[PDB]
């Protein structure tokens, strides 16, 4: 007659690592690393992402003629932009403090576009002829829809003195620009006056831009350049423009409808027609695991990212052969 002490074995095949030994077969284990994603771009908690596709943030905000899909956009959960979007800055140039603006966008879910200075409002200057072949729409020379390429009227460009005051409660993103022409003769041809300026002022802003003439390579078949500037106009503050040429005047400006909590993720993927609680630039995550190894940059209720290929905890004991 005999009594024995012993312990559980089973048919378990699961293996765990320790410091002194790798691939110890254990009776029970718990995987804590999510290795799977669906591979789509999905709505985040029902809320759809703003998927630019081909358009860039610049192309969108300035109103590139090819970026009409985004003339008015619903509030988004997050933004998606490609690595090299074709529809950016159709007319060649620069966007001043672009990255600091994109940074600001990552804390905004809703823009609401409102008109500040109407096209019809331009008496002494031509406002219908400020177009270019670098920015075409339906085969015809067009221009950034949110600004106005102002030109001389009957061989005169009088000093522009324009003022808008933010009556809205909400902060206001105001965009404007300056045209840098190719030579002395083009300055005359478009603006009449040889030497020009654009002075911009708010409660904080104290700006004066002067056109830079230079000879340069054609980008999009044009050697002229546009340089775009922006500000956030506080409630009850006014913005004062004064210019005698090269002015790219605001037509529309974006109301800062709401904050906050979004991202601008870089992805070549298209909309997936799905819904998730955690989104990565590579696809969505649906799991109860504490960790994942999909991508570092996520949005939503997400597991903690690690660069591991495998995280498995022993729960049971060393399984015997």
């Amino acid at each position: 007659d005999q009594i024995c002490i012993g312990y559980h074995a089973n048919n378990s095949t699961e293996q765990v690592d320790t410091i002194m030994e790798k691939n110890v077969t254990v009776t029970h284990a718990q995987d804590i690393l999510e290795k799977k994603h669906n591979g789509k771009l999905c709505d985040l908690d029902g809320v759809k992402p703003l998927i630019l596709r081909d358009c860039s943030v610049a192309g969108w905000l300035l109103g590139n003629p090819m970026c009409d899909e985004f003339i008015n956009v619903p509030e988004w959960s997050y933004i998606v932009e490609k690595a090299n979007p074709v529809n950016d800055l159709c007319y060649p140039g620069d966007f001043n403090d672009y990255e600091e603006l994109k940074h600001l966008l990552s804390r905004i879910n809703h823009f609401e576009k409102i008109q500040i200075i109407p096209k019809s409002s331009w008496s002494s200057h031509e406002a219908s002829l400020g177009v270019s072949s670098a920015c075409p729409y339906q085969g015809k020379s067009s221009f950034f829809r949110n600004v106005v390429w102002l030109i001389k009227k009957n061989s005169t460009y009088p000093t522009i003195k324009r003022s808008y005051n933010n009556t809205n409660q909400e902060d206001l993103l105001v965009l404007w620009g300056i045209h840098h022409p190719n030579d002395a003769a083009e300055q005359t041809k478009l603006y009449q006056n040889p030497t020009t300026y654009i002075s911009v002022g708010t409660s904080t802003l104290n700006q004066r831009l002067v056109p830079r003439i230079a000879t340069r390579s054609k980008v999009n078949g044009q050697s002229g350049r546009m340089e775009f500037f922006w500000t956030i106009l506080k409630p009850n503050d006014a913005i004062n423009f004064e210019s005698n040429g090269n002015f790219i005047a605001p037509e529309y400006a974006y109301k800062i409808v709401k904050k906050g909590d979004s991202t601008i993720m870089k992805s070549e993927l298209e909309y997936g027609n799905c819904n998730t609680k955690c989104q990565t630039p590579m696809g969505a995550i649906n799991s109860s695991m504490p960790f994942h190894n999909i991508h570092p940059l996520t949005i939503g209720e997400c597991p903690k990212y690690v660069k591991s290929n495998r995280l498995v905890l022993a729960t049971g004991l060393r399984n015997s052969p």
């Binding site: 024995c4 002490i5 312990y7 804590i32 905890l313």
Partner: protein
């Protein structure tokens, strides 16, 4: 393992014990079978459950990568940003992998400990009453029926 029981003096586990992690095999005239020790099994379940939760929650505060963009003449600051975000992800990857490694070793040893303690406890009751076979088993000097056997299991033998 550290405590000599699991795959030590007890050569292997029991496919036939299904209702617990540790227990007994008895063998007598009336027959033979397996009985799980519920007490130590339950203590072990609690231990391992708490551990997993402790491990998970101690990792819930970790670094979160955030997207930042830099122009063509901000290369140094872009590099700085890259090396900082990568640096933290490596720290946390290491923390996670090591914690799993070290605690897996401690879990296996924990089970070994639980088996040795249960063994020693039965050894302390039997005293000189049975021969200690040296493989986890004790061979009784006297005949030991089911209720005698039941007696050993509940710590009431003598």
């Amino acid at each position: 393992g550290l405590f000599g029981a699991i795959a030590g003096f007890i050569e292997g586990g029991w496919q036939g014990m299904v209702d617990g992690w540790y227990g007994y095999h008895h063998s007598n005239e009336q027959g033979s079978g397996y009985a799980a020790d519920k007490e130590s099994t339950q203590k072990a379940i609690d231990g391992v459950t708490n551990k997993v939760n402790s491990i998970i929650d101690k990792m819930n505060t970790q670094f979160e990568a955030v997207g930042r963009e830099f122009n063509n003449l901000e290369r140094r600051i872009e590099n700085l940003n890259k090396k900082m975000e990568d640096g933290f992800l490596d720290v946390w990857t290491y923390n996670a992998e090591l914690l799993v490694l070290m605690e897996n070793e401690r879990t296996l040893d924990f089970h070994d400990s639980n088996v040795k303690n249960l063994y020693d406890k039965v050894r302390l009751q039997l005293r000189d009453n049975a021969k200690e076979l040296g493989n986890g088993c004790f061979e009784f000097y006297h005949k030991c029926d089911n209720e005698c056997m039941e007696s050993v299991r509940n710590g009431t033998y003598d």
